[PDB]
Amino acid sequence: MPLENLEEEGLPKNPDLRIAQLRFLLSLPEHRGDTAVREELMAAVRENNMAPYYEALCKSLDWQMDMDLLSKMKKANEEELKRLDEELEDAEKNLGESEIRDAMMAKAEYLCQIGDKEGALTAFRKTYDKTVALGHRLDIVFYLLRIGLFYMDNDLITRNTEKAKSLIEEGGDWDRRNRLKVYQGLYCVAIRDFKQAAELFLDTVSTFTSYELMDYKTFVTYTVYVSMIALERPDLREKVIKGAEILEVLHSLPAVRQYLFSLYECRYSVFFQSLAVVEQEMKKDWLFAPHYRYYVREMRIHAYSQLLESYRSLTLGYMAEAFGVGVEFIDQELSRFIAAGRLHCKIDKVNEIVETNRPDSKNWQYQETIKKGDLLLNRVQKLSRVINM
Amino acid sequence: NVEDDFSNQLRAELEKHGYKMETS
Amino acid sequence: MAAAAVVEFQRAQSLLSTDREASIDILHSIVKRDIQENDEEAVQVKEQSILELGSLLAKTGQAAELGGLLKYVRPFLNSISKAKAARLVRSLLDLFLDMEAATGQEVELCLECIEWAKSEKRTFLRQALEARLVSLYFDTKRYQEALHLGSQLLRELKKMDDKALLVEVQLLESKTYHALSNLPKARAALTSARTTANAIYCPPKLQATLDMQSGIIHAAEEKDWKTAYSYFYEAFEGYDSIDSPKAITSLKYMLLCKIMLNTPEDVQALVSGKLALRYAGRQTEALKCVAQASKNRSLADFEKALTDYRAELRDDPIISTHLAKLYDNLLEQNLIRVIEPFSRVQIEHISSLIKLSKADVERKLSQMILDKKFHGILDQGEGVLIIFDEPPVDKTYEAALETIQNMSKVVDSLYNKAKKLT
């Protein structure tokens, strides 16, 4: 529910989309009352084309906030904060079992919606300790977590996550567990790693509740793309197409599945078509990192990797044809990967034959041992002098 | 190295052009 | 008594006398009157009403009259107020499902029915309607919906249960989840099914599903083809009295066991035309073509057949999984004999043994190398296939590679600690 705001706020942020995108982003805060969260989200971005207000930046986004939106924003943020003050006060005096637990709870849907950290830090923590219906506790801890993600503060988010971790096994509700997987994953992308995020994400696909989450169609497409950056072609490909995922969903996967399918088929020609369509639809609607490099780079090597494994020699003429991308472009894309050490092939362009070093036996490994060794040794020589003195 | 997405965008467009004419 | 005495005569008369377009008009008016009826027993009248309308369900057809007529069966069902009655109605539903109409109509009629059974009256009828909706959903490829409908019910009918009709929802669930590729869920539905079913005594149709369903679990999961074959025979015998989509799924399976054995002759010996001819089309022929293919030792026969057949693959889990094993196995057999005496074997020679074209074998081979299911390499620069001993890695070095990595993190830690000295 408040999760719907981050994905929309991603839309002006990413480089596949820009200016129009603010009008849609603006509509959601009036409707939900998420208004405080949106205002907060402008600061978090720190200018990548955002801030649709008549208050400031009227033509800079070429969209603006409405007058009703402004009065409602103020009304909603103040009401929640106002209630919070009195409930915090009244609650202490009476029963600790009942009164405080209820009072914090009453605030809590509203408190996350506004995204106000300060009021939240004290109120949220008190509820959890005292046992009641176990499913209820889990739901509540989730609202505390939503506030911290909005700012992109590392500290606040990590702090929030820990209370949930303790609680989840305690309740044991596997439906509720699945929610904790999504929050961690957003945060995991937030630092950098899609790789961590991917592992969590794959689990969430099984059992799904759309409460405190956006929608099930949005998430499945996210999960298959994030899985892919982490996982190689054999296992992910088999799960999405041959398994349940496309049949049940009733088609929203086609962009990401096409991208995996080409590798399986050994017709690279589809791979290159699939890249543009997946990039805009699936990957880039994200507040937490609309950063193509991890996705794109990992997929480009996976495509080459299988081709290199299957033959000791190839022609250029075959490579160029299969991909369909040009001779120069294929060389250029490769230049990064070989140099980085993702791959290890060469193209003798002028004679149009490609020689491939195989990944088999001690030799490929000897090359490898040395690579880890040089840096290790370098760190060692520094260490020997510093400790000794 | 890293921060590839920017150049990547340019790579994708040009590549398509080359991709249509050449492909089998 | 009214449903039989005037209604059946009047319906037969309108249809016999004046044209099929003319009668449709009379027919609408007759069903409206039916609500009230003029019954002297609600019980009897309702069993017969549902039966007479049930002639229309069987076609199934896509007429205007067909959609509206379907609506009438639902209040009539609630009013029936007899247990024995449920089985009758089930059969008419089976016939609506076997012969396809539009996707949308078929799903909605069954959805609406589930909710009304619940409103007016017992869980017992609500449950019976459910078996059919879940069956039809796997064919439509609306799995997500099938999962929600079947899972929800289970707890509620549990305190009710002493009755034969409830097992059937459990039987149907297992099939839909197994096609879905959710083995825990399929196994769960199986768990419920044999404990509840007790002994066979239950309607011939009910017995027909009980025997058929135990066979699927045994064949795919536990790999007991012998026990599976024997199950399928019993089931077949029970299916002959009715026509349902369930009856055709029984025909596939008996043939399937033989193909599995890897004697293709047995398959040909066995054929039982009794259910097969009714349903004849693509589903009947498929089991024989697959057998032909196994016999020939041609990948191509198998390859062609599989594309057309994919709707059949989706329909039942058993066929999809075993055909994948067979295709893959066959490729594997053909390939082993080709590599084994020749290293740098000619492309024409692999094309010829497998029975494919040169382009097609190389493509498929690419995938196989990656899996490393013969530990060779396809050399494009001569267009020759090479099999040699080229084992991936070795044990000392592989483990050592991981050891050198770990040390790198340790020396870093040592660098942090080390800061304090300076």
Side-chain angles (χ1 to χ4, degrees):
Chain A
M1 292 195 178
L3 183 57
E4 309 187 81
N5 202 322
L6 289 151
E7 285 72 281
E8 302 190 2
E9 182 60 279
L11 294 167
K13 190 192 200 297
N14 61 73
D16 280 48
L17 294 176
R18 192 69 72 190
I19 193 79
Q21 268 59 46
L22 284 314
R23 230 306 157 276
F24 198 71
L25 173 261
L26 190 279
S27 55
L28 185 280
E30 188 179 307
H31 177 64
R32 263 285 293 152
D34 286 337
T35 54
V37 141
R38 191 261 288 123
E39 184 180 344
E40 199 228 292
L41 278 150
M42 162 46 179
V45 183
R46 45 271 274 174
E47 194 57 73
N48 288 256
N49 197 260
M50 169 55 209
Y53 300 128
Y54 69 125
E55 302 289 301
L57 296 193
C58 302
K59 297 175 139 186
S60 180
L61 299 307
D62 208 23
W63 295 109
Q64 283 176 272
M65 146 176 83
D66 301 300
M67 207 300 285
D68 55 83
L69 228 170
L70 188 279
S71 63
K72 169 176 298 169
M73 176 158 70
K74 309 274 185 293
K75 177 70 210 182
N77 184 239
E78 82 67 47
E79 192 51 70
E80 172 43 52
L81 282 185
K82 162 173 57 192
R83 299 180 290 213
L84 188 134
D85 293 323
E86 302 165 288
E87 283 178 285
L88 211 57
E89 192 72 86
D90 304 332
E92 85 202 67
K93 326 194 198 181
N94 302 310
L95 300 173
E97 187 171 307
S98 307
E99 202 77 79
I100 98 182
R101 184 180 68 204
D102 194 336
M104 303 336 149
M105 186 273 276
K107 310 156 184 190
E109 169 78 57
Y110 302 110
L111 183 46
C112 64
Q113 181 191 297
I114 66 171
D116 189 79
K117 166 175 190 174
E118 185 172 69
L121 233 280
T122 196
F124 269 107
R125 177 198 70 248
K126 302 166 187 171
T127 325
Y128 299 135
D129 297 80
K130 307 299 295 307
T131 191
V132 65
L134 306 187
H136 183 41
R137 291 182 309 149
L138 269 60
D139 304 316
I140 293 155
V141 63
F142 301 156
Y143 306 133
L144 169 52
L145 197 21
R146 289 313 296 106
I147 294 148
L149 291 156
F150 292 130
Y151 293 92
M152 297 152 110
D153 278 357
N154 283 92
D155 309 71
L156 181 54
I157 311 157
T158 296
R159 187 202 85 108
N160 295 355
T161 302
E162 308 189 69
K163 301 182 212 288
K165 202 65 187 172
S166 304
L167 266 62
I168 52 169
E169 270 79 266
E170 208 173 326
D173 300 273
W174 273 71
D175 333 287
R176 293 189 182 78
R177 277 199 187 173
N178 305 123
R179 293 168 185 192
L180 176 276
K181 289 302 174 183
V182 182
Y183 306 122
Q184 296 180 327
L186 305 165
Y187 179 42
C188 284
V189 175
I191 56 184
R192 162 177 297 249
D193 278 272
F194 279 92
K195 317 294 189 57
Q196 287 184 337
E199 296 319 283
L200 314 166
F201 269 137
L202 203 161
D203 303 347
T204 331
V205 82
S206 293
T207 303
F208 196 94
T209 28
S210 288
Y211 174 37
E212 299 181 41
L213 289 172
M214 183 182 158
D215 190 55
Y216 173 68
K217 304 187 159 177
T218 301
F219 273 70
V220 306
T221 49
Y222 291 177
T223 304
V224 184
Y225 103 70
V226 64
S227 286
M228 222 164 39
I229 314 175
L231 275 301
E232 303 183 7
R233 102 83 172 103
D235 174 43
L236 194 272
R237 156 51 186 75
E238 283 295 289
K239 189 175 165 300
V240 68
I241 295 193
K242 178 164 207 171
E245 297 199 65
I246 74 304
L247 310 319
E248 75 196 289
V249 173
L250 218 69
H251 298 313
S252 191
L253 288 297
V256 72
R257 54 98 61 79
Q258 211 183 124
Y259 196 25
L260 42 107
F261 196 40
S262 43
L263 312 181
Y264 202 79
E265 286 194 288
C266 196
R267 58 174 291 183
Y268 299 127
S269 192
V270 164
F271 177 92
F272 207 57
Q273 292 182 148
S274 307
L275 182 156
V277 62
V278 83
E279 178 178 0
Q280 182 166 278
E281 300 182 2
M282 294 220 187
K283 170 86 177 69
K284 288 192 184 166
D285 325 294
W286 274 44
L287 192 262
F288 294 90
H291 296 157
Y292 211 38
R293 70 296 297 224
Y294 310 100
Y295 190 14
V296 73
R297 191 182 181 110
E298 280 271 282
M299 292 299 295
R300 288 175 165 175
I301 54 178
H302 298 332
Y304 280 123
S305 192
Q306 176 167 353
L307 186 54
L308 303 173
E309 165 67 34
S310 309
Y311 310 87
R312 100 172 51 204
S313 268
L314 305 98
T315 45
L316 177 68
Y318 174 77
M319 183 168 266
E321 167 275 300
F323 275 68
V325 200
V327 308
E328 202 187 65
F329 286 107
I330 276 167
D331 281 74
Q332 285 179 117
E333 283 172 280
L334 273 166
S335 193
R336 292 180 300 170
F337 308 152
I338 313 176
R342 305 299 196 255
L343 302 174
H344 288 300
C345 74
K346 297 85 69 182
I347 289 174
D348 286 308
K349 203 178 166 67
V350 204
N351 282 33
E352 322 176 62
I353 68 292
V354 321
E355 163 183 300
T356 287
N357 183 240
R358 300 200 56 86
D360 273 300
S361 300
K362 297 184 198 295
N363 188 247
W364 174 70
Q365 311 184 269
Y366 193 82
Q367 194 178 129
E368 284 192 273
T369 58
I370 287 314
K371 293 189 291 183
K372 295 188 187 296
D374 282 282
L375 58 118
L376 176 55
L377 189 61
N378 191 247
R379 197 52 53 88
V380 157
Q381 51 167 255
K382 203 288 299 181
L383 283 160
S384 57
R385 300 161 186 143
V386 74
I387 314 157
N388 196 75
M389 309 158 196
Chain B
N1 181 244
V2 69
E3 312 287 309
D4 304 285
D5 184 348
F6 315 92
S7 59
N8 201 81
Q9 292 178 236
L10 306 192
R11 300 185 65 77
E13 308 175 50
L14 308 171
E15 275 183 46
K16 291 289 180 305
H17 311 330
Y19 171 75
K20 290 170 176 317
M21 289 190 288
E22 197 187 66
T23 192
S24 285
Chain C
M1 168 167 292
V6 74
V7 187
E8 188 63 47
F9 187 71
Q10 288 287 302
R11 292 180 90 91
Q13 178 249 277
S14 190
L15 192 53
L16 201 60
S17 186
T18 192
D19 307 308
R20 179 59 198 187
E21 177 153 52
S23 63
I24 277 181
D25 306 288
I26 309 288
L27 220 66
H28 277 133
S29 294
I30 308 294
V31 291
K32 280 187 176 67
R33 197 187 70 76
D34 294 353
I35 295 281
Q36 312 161 271
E37 208 72 61
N38 64 271
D39 62 83
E40 58 181 66
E41 284 185 313
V43 174
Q44 181 179 30
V45 88
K46 294 309 171 172
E47 297 207 292
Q48 294 168 340
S49 53
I50 282 176
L51 237 299
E52 63 195 316
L53 266 67
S55 69
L56 289 104
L57 273 66
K59 310 163 45 269
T60 181
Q62 276 175 133
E65 174 51 54
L66 206 283
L69 187 286
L70 288 167
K71 303 304 161 180
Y72 289 92
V73 188
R74 191 163 61 247
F76 293 171
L77 188 59
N78 306 305
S79 203
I80 208 150
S81 69
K82 181 155 72 172
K84 179 168 70 86
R87 286 72 173 176
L88 312 155
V89 72
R90 203 51 34 239
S91 293
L92 312 172
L93 249 151
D94 285 291
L95 292 161
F96 182 74
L97 306 182
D98 198 74
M99 294 79 194
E100 300 288 291
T103 303
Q105 193 201 237
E106 280 170 283
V107 301
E108 294 299 270
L109 183 276
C110 301
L111 181 65
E112 291 166 273
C113 284
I114 320 301
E115 312 304 300
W116 293 40
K118 196 170 64 179
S119 295
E120 276 60 68
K121 58 171 300 193
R122 299 184 289 158
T123 46
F124 186 63
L125 277 285
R126 175 172 63 145
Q127 171 274 316
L129 296 153
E130 204 170 279
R132 301 280 127 261
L133 195 27
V134 178
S135 182
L136 187 271
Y137 265 164
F138 53 81
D139 301 299
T140 69
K141 323 175 168 176
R142 304 183 65 162
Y143 285 94
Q144 193 198 354
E145 295 299 289
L147 274 153
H148 191 93
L149 260 293
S151 193
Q152 180 175 230
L153 201 63
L154 314 153
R155 179 170 191 172
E156 304 186 65
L157 274 281
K158 208 62 67 169
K159 289 170 58 53
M160 198 177 224
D161 188 79
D162 295 301
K163 284 172 287 188
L165 200 47
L166 287 65
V167 71
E168 206 174 6
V169 270
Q170 305 314 140
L171 299 164
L172 260 293
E173 273 176 299
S174 187
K175 318 172 196 178
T176 301
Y177 310 159
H178 187 166
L180 198 266
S181 229
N182 278 179
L183 304 177
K185 299 280 196 299
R187 183 161 180 120
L190 191 273
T191 293
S192 296
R194 302 191 298 203
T195 193
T196 300
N198 184 185
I200 71 214
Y201 285 128
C202 66
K205 66 176 197 82
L206 216 296
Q207 183 185 0
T209 308
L210 294 159
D211 299 343
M212 181 181 75
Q213 210 266 282
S214 299
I216 72 164
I217 171 186
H218 285 114
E221 298 165 38
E222 309 172 344
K223 201 57 58 179
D224 308 301
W225 65 74
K226 193 211 74 187
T227 310
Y229 173 76
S230 301
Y231 263 126
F232 302 140
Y233 199 76
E234 304 182 57
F236 196 80
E237 286 199 295
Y239 277 121
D240 300 299
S241 60
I242 202 168
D243 293 324
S244 53
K246 305 181 295 283
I248 162 66
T249 307
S250 193
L251 183 279
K252 293 171 174 183
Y253 306 160
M254 298 151 87
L255 286 166
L256 187 44
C257 286
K258 283 71 180 304
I259 52 181
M260 269 152 79
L261 285 166
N262 303 108
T263 170
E265 301 174 314
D266 218 306
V267 180
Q268 305 286 324
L270 176 58
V271 302
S272 43
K274 305 174 76 177
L275 293 179
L277 197 49
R278 308 174 179 176
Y279 313 110
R282 172 190 86 253
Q283 294 175 104
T284 285
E285 203 174 59
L287 286 293
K288 317 185 169 165
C289 296
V290 161
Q292 170 178 72
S294 305
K295 194 200 291 311
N296 291 336
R297 71 164 55 236
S298 188
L299 198 74
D301 193 8
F302 221 116
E303 197 172 263
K304 171 193 99 291
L306 206 299
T307 52
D308 298 288
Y309 290 174
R310 90 93 65 186
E312 193 183 349
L313 275 63
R314 276 276 75 88
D315 197 303
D316 66 297
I318 315 298
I319 212 159
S320 56
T321 194
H322 297 132
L323 270 38
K325 192 198 83 266
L326 293 185
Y327 175 85
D328 194 56
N329 180 71
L330 196 75
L331 206 154
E332 274 301 83
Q333 280 181 89
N334 292 325
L335 166 53
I336 47 174
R337 218 287 305 134
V338 172
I339 53 167
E340 243 66 78
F342 298 92
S343 178
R344 293 200 189 158
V345 63
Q346 221 61 62
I347 185 55
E348 31 163 98
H349 184 250
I350 189 164
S351 66
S352 283
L353 202 299
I354 208 163
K355 293 174 182 168
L356 282 187
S357 180
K358 309 185 179 63
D360 194 279
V361 66
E362 296 174 291
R363 182 171 181 100
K364 306 320 176 73
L365 201 59
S366 312
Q367 306 178 28
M368 311 306 286
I369 299 159
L370 177 70
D371 288 54
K372 206 68 149 161
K373 274 186 176 161
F374 67 105
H375 65 102
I377 169 271
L378 176 35
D379 175 53
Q380 203 179 65
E382 300 178 311
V384 81
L385 161 69
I386 338 161
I387 151 67
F388 281 145
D389 302 287
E390 23 180 57
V393 301
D394 55 290
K395 202 180 172 301
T396 205
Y397 269 112
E398 78 181 39
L401 272 169
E402 303 176 77
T403 309
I404 314 295
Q405 199 195 265
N406 193 253
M407 295 303 117
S408 310
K409 206 268 160 174
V410 174
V411 288
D412 211 338
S413 316
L414 273 58
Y415 172 21
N416 299 69
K417 297 169 63 74
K419 293 304 309 313
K420 194 192 274 191
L421 300 175
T422 178

mmCIF file of all heavy atoms in Angstrom, chain A residues 4 8 12 81 130 136 187-188 196 199 215 250 279 299 306 308 351 357:
data_model
loop_
_atom_site.group_PDB
_atom_site.id
_atom_site.type_symbol
_atom_site.label_atom_id
_atom_site.label_comp_id
_atom_site.label_asym_id
_atom_site.label_seq_id
_atom_site.Cartn_x
_atom_site.Cartn_y
_atom_site.Cartn_z
ATOM 1 N N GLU A 4 3.422 1.109 -3.029
ATOM 2 C CA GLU A 4 3.005 1.598 -4.351
ATOM 3 C C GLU A 4 3.689 2.921 -4.699
ATOM 4 O O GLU A 4 4.072 3.052 -5.861
ATOM 5 C CB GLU A 4 1.529 1.897 -4.474
ATOM 6 C CG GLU A 4 0.600 0.770 -4.004
ATOM 7 C CD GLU A 4 -0.821 1.280 -4.431
ATOM 8 O OE1 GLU A 4 -1.201 1.118 -5.660
ATOM 9 O OE2 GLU A 4 -1.557 1.849 -3.526
ATOM 10 N N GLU A 8 6.261 4.093 -8.120
ATOM 11 C CA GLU A 8 5.905 5.273 -8.937
ATOM 12 C C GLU A 8 7.007 6.362 -8.891
ATOM 13 O O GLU A 8 7.346 6.929 -9.905
ATOM 14 C CB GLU A 8 4.553 5.982 -8.600
ATOM 15 C CG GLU A 8 3.330 5.103 -8.698
ATOM 16 C CD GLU A 8 1.997 5.851 -8.606
ATOM 17 O OE1 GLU A 8 1.893 7.118 -8.502
ATOM 18 O OE2 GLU A 8 0.976 5.121 -8.618
ATOM 19 N N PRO A 12 10.044 8.749 -12.500
ATOM 20 C CA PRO A 12 10.727 9.956 -12.998
ATOM 21 C C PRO A 12 12.221 9.743 -12.859
ATOM 22 O O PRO A 12 12.985 10.421 -13.525
ATOM 23 C CB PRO A 12 10.298 11.083 -12.085
ATOM 24 C CG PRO A 12 9.563 10.428 -10.844
ATOM 25 C CD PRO A 12 9.046 9.149 -11.453
ATOM 26 N N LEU A 81 0.182 13.068 13.857
ATOM 27 C CA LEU A 81 1.168 13.513 14.819
ATOM 28 C C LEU A 81 0.389 13.901 16.071
ATOM 29 O O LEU A 81 0.804 13.519 17.169
ATOM 30 C CB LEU A 81 1.994 14.735 14.383
ATOM 31 C CG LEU A 81 3.095 14.329 13.381
ATOM 32 C CD1 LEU A 81 3.926 15.644 13.125
ATOM 33 C CD2 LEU A 81 4.068 13.220 13.689
ATOM 34 N N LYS A 130 4.965 -7.685 24.564
ATOM 35 C CA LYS A 130 3.740 -8.216 25.137
ATOM 36 C C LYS A 130 3.022 -9.096 24.155
ATOM 37 O O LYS A 130 2.722 -8.628 23.040
ATOM 38 C CB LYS A 130 2.772 -7.171 25.853
ATOM 39 C CG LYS A 130 3.488 -6.300 26.959
ATOM 40 C CD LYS A 130 4.085 -7.052 28.151
ATOM 41 C CE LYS A 130 3.039 -7.769 29.039
ATOM 42 N NZ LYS A 130 1.860 -7.001 29.580
ATOM 43 N N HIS A 136 -0.767 -10.720 14.425
ATOM 44 C CA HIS A 136 -0.899 -9.359 14.556
ATOM 45 C C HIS A 136 0.439 -8.681 14.771
ATOM 46 O O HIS A 136 0.590 -7.601 14.168
ATOM 47 C CB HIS A 136 -1.928 -9.037 15.715
ATOM 48 C CG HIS A 136 -2.259 -7.607 15.965
ATOM 49 N ND1 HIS A 136 -2.457 -6.670 14.949
ATOM 50 C CD2 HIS A 136 -2.409 -6.890 17.130
ATOM 51 C CE1 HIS A 136 -2.726 -5.473 15.585
ATOM 52 N NE2 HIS A 136 -2.681 -5.566 16.915
ATOM 53 N N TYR A 187 15.936 -3.027 0.368
ATOM 54 C CA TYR A 187 17.088 -2.494 1.062
ATOM 55 C C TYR A 187 18.337 -3.052 0.501
ATOM 56 O O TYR A 187 19.355 -2.353 0.439
ATOM 57 C CB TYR A 187 17.018 -2.746 2.602
ATOM 58 C CG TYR A 187 18.262 -2.212 3.351
ATOM 59 C CD1 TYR A 187 18.842 -0.930 3.013
ATOM 60 C CD2 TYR A 187 18.822 -2.914 4.410
ATOM 61 C CE1 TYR A 187 19.902 -0.393 3.735
ATOM 62 C CE2 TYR A 187 19.875 -2.404 5.135
ATOM 63 C CZ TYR A 187 20.433 -1.164 4.863
ATOM 64 O OH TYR A 187 21.565 -0.717 5.579
ATOM 65 N N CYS A 188 18.371 -4.364 0.107
ATOM 66 C CA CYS A 188 19.600 -5.002 -0.389
ATOM 67 C C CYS A 188 20.009 -4.273 -1.653
ATOM 68 O O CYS A 188 21.217 -3.992 -1.677
ATOM 69 C CB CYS A 188 19.518 -6.496 -0.737
ATOM 70 S SG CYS A 188 19.506 -7.496 0.704
ATOM 71 N N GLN A 196 22.269 -10.351 -3.314
ATOM 72 C CA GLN A 196 21.638 -10.681 -2.046
ATOM 73 C C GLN A 196 20.170 -10.671 -2.173
ATOM 74 O O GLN A 196 19.463 -11.556 -1.717
ATOM 75 C CB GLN A 196 22.032 -9.637 -1.001
ATOM 76 C CG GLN A 196 23.435 -9.689 -0.466
ATOM 77 C CD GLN A 196 23.567 -8.569 0.665
ATOM 78 O OE1 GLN A 196 22.743 -7.657 0.563
ATOM 79 N NE2 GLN A 196 24.666 -8.472 1.492
ATOM 80 N N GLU A 199 18.219 -13.595 -3.917
ATOM 81 C CA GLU A 199 18.060 -14.841 -3.166
ATOM 82 C C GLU A 199 16.798 -14.790 -2.402
ATOM 83 O O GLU A 199 16.017 -15.767 -2.349
ATOM 84 C CB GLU A 199 19.142 -15.120 -2.128
ATOM 85 C CG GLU A 199 20.577 -15.338 -2.617
ATOM 86 C CD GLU A 199 20.531 -16.202 -3.875
ATOM 87 O OE1 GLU A 199 20.327 -17.443 -3.584
ATOM 88 O OE2 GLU A 199 20.808 -15.736 -5.001
ATOM 89 N N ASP A 215 1.235 -5.215 -5.930
ATOM 90 C CA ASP A 215 0.459 -6.172 -6.641
ATOM 91 C C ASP A 215 1.435 -7.254 -7.065
ATOM 92 O O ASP A 215 2.655 -7.118 -7.352
ATOM 93 C CB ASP A 215 -0.164 -5.534 -7.906
ATOM 94 C CG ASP A 215 -1.164 -6.440 -8.533
ATOM 95 O OD1 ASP A 215 -2.059 -6.824 -7.821
ATOM 96 O OD2 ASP A 215 -1.038 -6.667 -9.781
ATOM 97 N N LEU A 250 -0.807 -15.733 -16.292
ATOM 98 C CA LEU A 250 -1.491 -15.480 -17.422
ATOM 99 C C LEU A 250 -0.873 -14.321 -18.154
ATOM 100 O O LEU A 250 -1.493 -13.329 -18.426
ATOM 101 C CB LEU A 250 -3.081 -15.265 -17.364
ATOM 102 C CG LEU A 250 -3.952 -15.817 -18.482
ATOM 103 C CD1 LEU A 250 -4.054 -17.373 -18.549
ATOM 104 C CD2 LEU A 250 -5.346 -15.123 -18.501
ATOM 105 N N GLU A 279 14.381 -3.789 -20.066
ATOM 106 C CA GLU A 279 15.076 -2.699 -19.410
ATOM 107 C C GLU A 279 14.063 -1.696 -18.961
ATOM 108 O O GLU A 279 14.103 -1.368 -17.772
ATOM 109 C CB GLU A 279 15.973 -1.968 -20.537
ATOM 110 C CG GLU A 279 16.744 -0.738 -20.013
ATOM 111 C CD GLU A 279 17.596 -0.158 -21.121
ATOM 112 O OE1 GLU A 279 17.544 -0.758 -22.272
ATOM 113 O OE2 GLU A 279 18.344 0.841 -20.905
ATOM 114 N N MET A 299 24.060 -10.307 -17.874
ATOM 115 C CA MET A 299 23.419 -11.005 -18.925
ATOM 116 C C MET A 299 24.222 -11.130 -20.186
ATOM 117 O O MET A 299 24.209 -12.163 -20.824
ATOM 118 C CB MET A 299 22.062 -10.447 -19.345
ATOM 119 C CG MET A 299 21.019 -10.647 -18.213
ATOM 120 S SD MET A 299 20.628 -12.426 -17.650
ATOM 121 C CE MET A 299 19.892 -13.044 -19.167
ATOM 122 N N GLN A 306 28.015 -19.506 -22.498
ATOM 123 C CA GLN A 306 27.541 -20.755 -23.093
ATOM 124 C C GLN A 306 28.129 -21.016 -24.496
ATOM 125 O O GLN A 306 28.492 -22.159 -24.794
ATOM 126 C CB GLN A 306 25.997 -20.681 -23.215
ATOM 127 C CG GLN A 306 25.420 -21.939 -23.926
ATOM 128 C CD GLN A 306 23.882 -22.210 -23.869
ATOM 129 O OE1 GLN A 306 23.141 -21.530 -23.169
ATOM 130 N NE2 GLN A 306 23.466 -23.141 -24.696
ATOM 131 N N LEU A 308 31.063 -19.903 -25.629
ATOM 132 C CA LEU A 308 32.450 -20.289 -25.418
ATOM 133 C C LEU A 308 32.679 -21.661 -24.902
ATOM 134 O O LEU A 308 33.576 -22.414 -25.400
ATOM 135 C CB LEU A 308 33.154 -19.182 -24.600
ATOM 136 C CG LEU A 308 33.090 -17.783 -25.227
ATOM 137 C CD1 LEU A 308 33.686 -16.762 -24.221
ATOM 138 C CD2 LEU A 308 33.649 -17.669 -26.629
ATOM 139 N N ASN A 351 41.297 -12.047 -39.597
ATOM 140 C CA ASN A 351 41.312 -13.323 -40.360
ATOM 141 C C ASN A 351 39.914 -13.940 -40.157
ATOM 142 O O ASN A 351 39.563 -14.865 -40.911
ATOM 143 C CB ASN A 351 42.458 -14.290 -39.948
ATOM 144 C CG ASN A 351 43.767 -13.795 -40.598
ATOM 145 O OD1 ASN A 351 43.991 -12.562 -40.783
ATOM 146 N ND2 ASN A 351 44.612 -14.782 -40.927
ATOM 147 N N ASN A 357 39.759 -20.112 -25.033
ATOM 148 C CA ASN A 357 40.399 -20.925 -24.022
ATOM 149 C C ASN A 357 39.318 -21.601 -23.247
ATOM 150 O O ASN A 357 38.392 -21.009 -22.759
ATOM 151 C CB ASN A 357 41.328 -20.069 -23.126
ATOM 152 C CG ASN A 357 42.099 -20.893 -22.072
ATOM 153 O OD1 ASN A 357 41.941 -20.643 -20.875
ATOM 154 N ND2 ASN A 357 42.875 -21.923 -22.498
#
